[PDB]
Amino acid sequence: PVNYITFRNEPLVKDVEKGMSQQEVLRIGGTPSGTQKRLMKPGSCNSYILNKDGQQQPFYVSFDGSGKVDGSGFLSCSELDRHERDA
User: Which residues form the Outer membrane protein assembly factor BamE domain (predicted)?
Assistant: First the structure.
């Protein structure tokens, strides 16, 4: 259960916006732990581990087929793929 307050000032959480380009997200968030093609939708996904105040928390940012942010959230990209396959 993620305590959003702990992470609210993380650049990936505070500053990444819908429609943002891949390069702007790289600048804001730094090097992803991993990148991959989205399993179920056009586009791609970047996985991160947020580290704040001794707490680690997976995070992702996804991009649509045009390359623009369409999502983000407190799970890994392989979790995301697990979810889009089921839903």
Answer: 6-72
Name the method of structure determination. X-ray
In this structure, which CATH number among 3.40.50.980, 3.90.226.10, 3.30.1330.40, 3.30.1450.10 belongs to the domain 1-87?
A: 3.30.1450.10
Give the neighbor-by-neighbor strand order of the sheet with 34-37.
34-37, 44-52, 55-63, 69-73
In the chain, which ranges are E strands?
34-37, 44-52, 55-63, 69-73
Residue type, 64: D
* Closest to 74 (Cα-Cα) out of 43, 49, 52: 49
Phi, psi (deg, nearest 5) at residue 10: -65, 135
Which resolution in angstroms does this entry have? 1.5
